Design a protein around this ligand. Structure first.
Ligand SMILES: O=C(N[C@H]1COC(=O)[C@@H](NC(=O)c2cccc(O)c2O)COC(=O)[C@@H](NC(=O)c2cccc(O)c2O)COC1=O)c1cccc(O)c1O
Ligand SMILES: [Fe+3]
Ligand code: NA
Length: 427
């Protein structure tokens, strides 16, 4: 028995609030070159699970294995601890992949994560966005079940030339029910004016929303203050990309709220300004119409930030929920109720004061529950969940758990699923 890298999987089962730690999956040599992986995203489509196994380089175990067999670039192996935050490294590791010019997708026939089908492409680098410790999902399904695998080519900012990818940001495709790539390929940098992206989502049909970088990619996801609409089958199945018109221009935007809320063929996203002085400059929710790639200003949020947008319902009661942060001399979080995202305002206070702890990731399960996932660096994550009660008020569900540290999440079936690469002992 020895300490190896593994893939931890946590299930948050929404019907009964049960939390399950899966047996840890062996991550050493997950892709056949010795490197270990971090899952990026958990996508359900065609009754399968799709994730992107993002290579991490070699663990200490990986660089020791069979007399260093897996070490292609020994000049990159570390001889002491170093690095910072979630990118700290230890003596003997080879940090980040030696194989940046490829992407993998792992496909599972159900949520037990047994017997993956693994498919490799040379057309794109690995399929995830990166923000501090977090691995953002960039694999998404069209309405017909075709899965589009996007890569922002994050690896371009690696220090070591051999660890940089030379592939532009781009997209490939897995047709519904298939477990091979087809021939589809779109070079996104040729459509975006040379720009890449932080993360992306599905809007409707074959329209996807990309949160675009304004300049160079960076490790903190800052300055990703444009949106663009991608029509995957546009221009004779070559892809079409349009920057969104009608949002505040980038030098007014501090950040976007994160995961959009999609209904009725459009996307809603929160915009947090750099300077929020005066009501017309407070954070606000914008509606993005993918057909016209046009945004319109909607609900104003009289708070410091916006962190989630969705819908909660119970019996005949139903409301939009906007998660909003308020920073003073620390930071409070409020779940604000509204019947519209497109006008008026919401303000934390006596008639809208459901306070929660802050969260790193906010996930709506359908219109039934809101899950908060709190990231705590090297320590355990924390999760709470929220619903409408039978009176129609927002309420916290009773079970509050520490969970394995997570760096990605998604949904399959009745489970919110979260994952990260962990140390584990195996036979
Ligand atoms: O809110 C989060 N952090 C807090 C608390 O974390 C910390 O204070 C420190 N941090 C760790 O010790 C850490 C130890 C082990 C693991 C860590 O991830 C640590 O961060 C320093 O991080 C920082 O100063 C900043 N951080 C990065 O620049 C970063 C750069 C590259 C890579 C990073 O991970 C970075 O944090 C800001 O982050 C914070 O202050 C937070 C949120 C979302 C995702 C995060 O990763 C956050 O950490
Ligand atoms: Fe961090
Ligand atoms: Na360093």
């Amino acid at each position: 028995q020895s300490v190896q890298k593994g893939i931890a999987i946590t299930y948050l089962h929404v019907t009964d609030q049960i939390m399950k730690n899966r047996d840890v999956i062996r991550g050493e040599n997950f892709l056949g070159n010795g490197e270990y992986v971090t899952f990026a995203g958990i996508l359900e489509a065609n009754n399968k699970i799709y994730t992107a196994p993002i290579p991490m380089g070699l663990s200490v175990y990986g660089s020791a294995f069979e007399d260093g067999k897996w070490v292609k670039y020994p000049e990159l192996v570390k001889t002491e601890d170093g690095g910072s935050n979630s990118s700290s490294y230890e003596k003997g590791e080879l940090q980040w992949t030696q194989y940046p010019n490829e992407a993998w997708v792992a496909i599972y026939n159900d949520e037990n994560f047994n017997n993956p089908t693994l498919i490799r492409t040379d057309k794109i680098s690995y399929a995830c966005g990166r923000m501090r410790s977090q691995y953002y999902q960039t694999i998404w399904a069209a309405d017909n079940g075709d899965v589009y695998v996007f890569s922002p080519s994050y690896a371009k900012i690696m220090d070591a030339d051999v660890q940089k990818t030379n592939l532009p940001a781009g997209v490939v495709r897995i047709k519904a029910g298939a477990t091979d790539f087809d021939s589809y390929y779109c070079n996104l940098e040729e459509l975006s004016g040379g720009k890449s992206f932080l993360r992306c989502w599905h809007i409707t049909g074959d329209y996807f929303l990309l949160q675009m970088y304004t300049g160079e990619i960076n490790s903190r996801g800052t300055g990703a203050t444009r949106m663009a609409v991608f029509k995957a089958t546009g221009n004779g199945d070559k892809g079409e990309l349009y920057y969104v018109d009608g949002l505040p221009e980038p030098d007014r935007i501090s950040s976007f709220s994160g995961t959009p809320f999609c209904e009725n063929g459009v996307a809603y996203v929160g915009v947090i300004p750099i300077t929020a002085d005066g009501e017309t400059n407070h954070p606000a929710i914008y509606k993005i119409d993918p057909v016209t790639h046009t945004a319109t200003k909607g609900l104003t949020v009289n708070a410091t930030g916006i962190t989630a947008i969705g819908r909660l319902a119970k019996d005949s009661h139903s409301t939009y929920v906007v998660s909003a942060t308020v920073t003073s001399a620390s930071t409070a979080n409020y779940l604000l109720a509204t019947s519209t995202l497109e006008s008026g305002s919401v303000t934390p206070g006596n008639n809208n004061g459901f306070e929660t702890a802050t969260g790193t990731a906010w996930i709506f399960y359908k219109d039934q529950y809101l899950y908060r996932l709190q990231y705590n660096q090297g320590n355990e994550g924390v999760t709470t969940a929220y619903e409408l009660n039978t009176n129609g008020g927002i309420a916290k569900r009773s079970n509050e758990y520490t969970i394995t540290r997570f760096t990605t999440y998604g949904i399959f079936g009745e489970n919110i699923i979260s994952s990260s690469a962990v140390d584990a002992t195996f036979t």
